[PDB]
Design a protein around this ligand. Structure first.
Ligand SMILES: *[C@@H]1O[C@H](CO)[C@@H](O)[C@H](O)[C@H]1NC(C)=O
Ligand SMILES: *[C@@H]1O[C@H](CO)[C@@H](O)[C@H](O)[C@H]1NC(C)=O
Lengths: 48, 36, 53
């Protein structure tokens, strides 16, 4: 289901699932450091 | 529950020759015409 | 009263009789529908009524 007409007022709107994706953790060896980076895959960085 | 003649046709303005007698109905619908 | 006479001929339906099966919008898609359709290139009785019919 991509488009729906509003029952109250006849206007065609698009319903789309909003931001979602996978999360990857980039880390060095846990003995080297505990700092990590996070890669939110497939999403624009304004969404997160 | 109409009973019609063996050759039903509309008179136009009336509907006498189509069905001889009318009795208990079950549905009705009045809307904008099909044929323009 | 009886005043109507019918004459029967036969013609070809070609590709006439396709309708929208459901009121679900679909754009740029090939969709398969199993429904009661008029078969393509079918013999369609052409009746002339001049005034058991
Ligand atoms: C991602 O966001 C940036 C923010 O500046 C924007 O310029 C870019 O067009 C966006 N890309 C997509 C695919 O939304
Ligand atoms: C089938 O259609 C053709 C073309 O209209 C016609 O000549 C033929 O008689 C038809 N056959 C019957 C009897 O259904």
């Amino acid at each position: 289901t991509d488009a729906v007409r509003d029952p109250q007022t006849l206007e065609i709107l698009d319903i789309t699932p909003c931001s979602f994706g996978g999360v990857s953790v980039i880390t060095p060896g846990t003995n080297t450091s505990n700092q990590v980076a996070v890669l939110y895959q497939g999403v624009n960085c304004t969404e997160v | 529950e109409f009973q019609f003649c063996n050759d039903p046709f509309l008179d136009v303005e009336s509907e006498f020759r189509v069905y001889s007698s009318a009795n208990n109905c079950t549905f009705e619908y009045v809307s904008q015409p099909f044929l323009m | 009263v009886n005043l109507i006479t019918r004459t029967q001929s036969y013609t070809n339906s070609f590709t006439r009789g396709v309708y929208y099966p459901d009121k679900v919008f679909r754009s740029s898609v090939l969709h398969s529908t199993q429904d009661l359709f008029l078969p393509f290139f079918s013999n369609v009785t052409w009746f002339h009524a001049i005034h058991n019919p």
